Amino acid sequence: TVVTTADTSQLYALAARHGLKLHGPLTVNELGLDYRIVIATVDDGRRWVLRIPRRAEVSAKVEPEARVLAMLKNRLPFAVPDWRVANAELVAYPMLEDSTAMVIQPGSSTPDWVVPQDSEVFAESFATALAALHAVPISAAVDAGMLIRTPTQARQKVADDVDRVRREFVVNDKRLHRWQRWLDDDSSWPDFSVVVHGDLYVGHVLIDNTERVSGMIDWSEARVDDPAIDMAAHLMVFGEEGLAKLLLTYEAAGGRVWPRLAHHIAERLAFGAVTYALFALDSGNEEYLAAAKAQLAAAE
Template identity: 35%
Template sequence: MELAQYASELLGVDLDPATARPDESGWDFHVTHITDTGGSPWILRRPRHPQAARQLGTEGAVLAAVRDRLPVAVPHWRLQSPRLVAYPRLPGVQAGAEDPRTLVYGWDIDPLAAPDAYLEPLARALAEVHRTPHEALPALEAPTPEALRSAVADRLARARSELRLPAARTRRWRAWLDDDSLWPDRMVVVHGDVHPGHTLVERAPVGPPRLSGLLDWGNAGINDPAVDFVDMLYAGGPPVLDLLLNAYRRAGGEVRPGMRAHVLARASFLWVHVALRGLDAARPAWVETALSRIGA
């Protein structure tokens, strides 16, 4: 059965197959933009692999827990199954996109031009996400800070055995892992994948584009709060990180001593995750891109 018909039957909404437009840019989901016969736009997401399908339960639970807390919109799922998620498309356009070949983010806005329109509301949204009580997600297991650190150490050990890692960079990662002052002492609810392509902005006739939504919560869960700053650092550099952290502090978020250094270290270690993901997904281009960044 074709996707539009299958989704229409499950939703009880008449989707027009002639309007279906695939978006294959995501790592974990096949995405289809489609419009119903009344002209309303929808998003259909299908998992690319079993791990993405398993993560849907966590993603849906986090979305339900944070939806009414945030100053911006998040997806409101109208259909959730292991094979398909569907929801009305949020208004706005992506603030940027990732080049699938180079894995470099390109901006369609200037994130530094009007911080009060983009970075500051993003910081307020992240502060609210991180304040979400764990009790709102009783089915999720919260890792201990020690377990989190151990998992990172295990990934480094695997990467050292399977990849060509520069010795100097490996020593810096070991020093980061061994520095108690840099690591958080508590875990929080996180989005897990905050970058320009997962932020929506709305343009007005006058004034700068304003943040309007947060997309793709597929990596959401309970984790180190620093993970929600890593990709924004990578996309916008230290100026974006510093404005975001300062706004996050003003919004009531906890910026520990050493948190900035911890985000910087996590950002450099991001390429280890990408390389290992490339190995597991048989995507040699990801591996080569990641190794070139690690060696830079």
Template identity: 40%
Template sequence: MSTLDDALGLAALHALPLSPNGATVVEAGLDYRVIMATDETGHRWVLRVPRRPDVSEGMAAEIRILDFVAPTLRSEKVAVPDWQIRTPELIAYPALPGAPGLTLSDAGEPIWHMDPASQDYAVRLGRLLARLHSLDAMEARTAGIEVRSPEQVRQTWQDDINRVSREFTVAPALSEAWHSWVGDDICWPDRTVMTHGEIYPAHVLLDQDGAITGVLDWTTARVDDPARDFAFQYGAAGDEILQVTLDAYEQAGGHLHPGLAAQSRHLWEASPLGYAIYAQTTGAEADRAAAAAMLNPEA
């Protein structure tokens, strides 16, 4: 049986009959397969099928995150998923308004549905992040959301570097850059904030006028380094557009610590480290091989 048949069968078991006609499967996510399908009234639904048991174990945490951020983002006319079905095997929710700014082809190639160097998008994102980051960290802790202090953020990166270096061969230049970064006091935040963690156009929904209408996939959200939410802006569009986003963020009330721009660049450049941690989590040989190639590209 196919992934599509499995997912539609699970939905039907939970009294959500969906049509296979026009249904699509998105394999791009590292943690979930995503199926888009239509019910008998013509409404679109999103089905998320966990790829691994550890993903299912994190569902309760994501529910707490969604409940915490939804009222604030809703006041900004930005929707987040409203899980109508929440089981270890399946999550289902009505599709949010808008369309993602980035999707992947069947071959895994990026397909842009917006200009990643758009100044309009950069401003809108900066304003949205200022609102998200304004949420109170102590209230997040009370809501059961993970909270990391600035010291914990820095130590966790050091621990991850050590962990990856024990299991993989890391190119000397990359290793030296990581240790220099961790030792650079200017880069690290003086406060931590409520972050999404993977906010980039694949997880951002836009209307035809470019307004942000929704934000998807809150799996990695927590109180953490604000630079987490700016790293992709640097990776996709470079320093100039990153600065536009940071300027809009500051103007909307976001706290701009001196090393935020540099930290955003460092986090993007640390992507191989993050992927290596993911490969250690899955244990899949293909993932480990891909991580090894990223960590030591000239081997």
């Protein structure tokens, strides 16, 4: 008798209700506010990811998300989760065994590793993979029931998010001015939307052992919206140097750009403070809320 974090009996029963027979080693992440994520071995000798919604309001997202992934599968030259099980109580897919492009121990505030700035294979393949994603036709997104934002709707969403933060929190005056100026700066904003991943950073990108992008995961924020949404974290991790390389190759690979794209991406990155604060507020988590309030009040 040894106490373990995972409830093997309950997990076995849950998986078996959906055609999966668990057998062998498993791993459990409950840091997620909305899902328990288990990597478990099944009787096919293979590891599967069990993505377990915690509550009814999370379960409600499974059906639309499943439609997105089904559409994306043939239209991307890289892997995405294959949700062979997709229901309100359980999503499950064969694990995409390639590593994420950032490795971190659960709970830790410091990664063990991030794919290096000087990895040209990563930089180049991320840029072409991103062009490929952003080339998925709008029609395919509509046919799959995706959330669609025109450029006007995209800008309105940012305005709404800023306004909600301004109502719920006390924000440094310079941040408020920055966001307002951005919202009013016509030349920053794109005149088109594309299919975006929506929560894209190195931790959601898979790479083969040569550091070539081979997949992307965690697609819950996917939608048709401002392309720069998917470039902010690249700027955050790889700096202006990395961003410059990305935009050159992205454009060469057929990605649509506009003159003030680099500027707009930096403003999108600054807007991450809004996204975080609203995440914190909606989470009800007090540690996240404390961090958000401290960030918002602080000068950038």
